[PDB]
């Protein structure tokens with residue numbers, strides 16, 4: 362199939378998709394648009410949002426819906442119907458927290474203030490829940506890597522930018538990040554991808 | 560399997576699961592708790608959130624992850640992987656919007672302020688996009704009902720409570736709502752379900 366992923370030049374909400382393509386060794390057009398080119402594109406979209414993934418002429422939207430589609434029938438989806446549910450559940454739990462941040466707030470002072478508050482008063486509870494959930498296991502779900510692990514690594518990479526000590530109390534979550542980063546295909550993408558703040 | 564759904568005594572985020580169980584004709588325990596029950600309960604939850612679904616003692620969380628789990632391999636899932644992606648996308652677009660509302664904000668007005676903005680400006684645009692997306696088609700995805708249609712009817716029901724004229728200019732979305740409500744198993748549920756504001 363011919364794939365074309367459209368998003369801004371940043372990891373953001375499209376990174377999970379890029380990790381999946383890398384892991385699966387699938388070629389695709391990583392189309393990164395400049396802010397100025399967004400308006401004319403937005404008007405042609407279903408619900409005016411990106412990322413979107415074009416597959417043989419048809420358009421798909423919603424980052425997680427796309428990610429799930431790409432992992433279907435692969436080892437990244439989950440090893441049992443119930444584990445597949447757990448993968449989806451961990452992914453939404455992580456996405457729910459990421460969606461709490463005022464990424465679009467114009468006023469920098471209020472934005473920064475809210476970021477710091479969420480990272481100091483709210484994040485600790487989620488990190489603990491995740492640590493407890495992971496326990497002494499190697500991966501978040503099952504006994505092999507799933508895209509939920511990829512998502513943890515992607516989300517935490519961004520949160521760590523704003524809160525360096527985020528995982529100082531949870532070395533097990535740090536270990537998981539490193540394990541994902543060590544997967545050859547993932548390590549390679551991480552090394553070659555455009556370096557952007559977000 | 561023994562199914563036990565735990566949530567507040569309201570439709571909310573659990574209604575989609577309730578609709579699925581009804582449609583598929585699956586018996587389950589519809590456990591509804593009151594606020595005075597939450598505290599002790601929350602302490603016993605993976606990520607302190609409801610709804611949760613217990614399957615033979617095993618706890619599953621995240622409403623959409625659970626909803627997807629129950630509809631896999633059924634006629635509500637989507638007929639192709641691509642269509643399954645569209646179902647997931649439509650559901651997340653709707654969930655994204657519903658999640659924007661400050662349901663928990665404590666101040667009667669600061670809350671009503673964000674609500675007004677969401678209902679007066681954001682809502683109309685989403686309705687337009689959805690209406691355009693549906694076109695003259697019978698259901699949102701494919702040629703048969705899917706849980707995405709279920710979600711549309713559920714989400715729109717709550718939105719209508721705050722903005723009665725939401726669908727005045729989109730009769731096609733109203734027709735879809737009625738189609739879902741006319742499905743025997745669903746109609747029976749809508750008839751017998753506890754009457755709650757949300």
Ligand SMILES: O=c1[nH][nH]c(=O)c2cc(-[n+]3nc(/C=C/c4ccccc4)nn3-c3nc4ccccc4s3)ccc12
Nearest residue numbers: 371373374456459460463464465466515516519558559
């Ligand atoms: O409301 C917005 N308007 N315009 C935006 O560009 C924008 C960006 C935005 N961002 N989201 C994210 C990542 C989200 C995420 C969610 C789940 C998992 C992983 C990631 N990043 N991000 C932005 N970053 C930057 C950096 C520099 C300058 C501007 C931006 S936006 C959210 C909302 C909006």
Ligand SMILES: O=c1[nH][nH]c(=O)c2cc(-[n+]3nc(/C=C/c4ccccc4)nn3-c3nc4ccccc4s3)ccc12
Nearest residue numbers: 567570571572654657658661662663713714717756757
């Ligand atoms: O912060 C909260 N804590 N506990 C809660 O139970 C809770 C519920 C809540 N609410 N969510 C919804 C509906 C969500 C929805 C999402 C997708 C599709 C359709 C629906 N309603 N809701 C509440 N409603 C009321 C009404 C009166 C008094 C209190 C509440 S909570 C939001 C936050 C929380």
Ligand SMILES: N[C@@H](CCC(=O)N[C@@H](CS)C(=O)NCC(=O)O)C(=O)O
Nearest residue numbers: 373374409410411412423424425655
């Ligand atoms: N939940 C959606 C979020 C879609 C979304 O809001 N995308 C933002 C960028 S991360 C966007 O399109 N912003 C431009 C706009 O809203 O005009 C997903 O994961 O795809």
Ligand SMILES: N[C@@H](CCC(=O)N[C@@H](CS)C(=O)NCC(=O)O)C(=O)O
Nearest residue numbers: 457571572607608609610621622623
């Ligand atoms: N995205 C989650 C939302 C989970 C959530 O926030 N649930 C609320 C009820 S609507 C809750 O448990 N609130 C109590 C709390 O957060 O302490 C889902 O759909 O399951």
Ligand SMILES: [Mg+2]
Nearest residue numbers: 453456651654
């Ligand atoms: Mg979501």
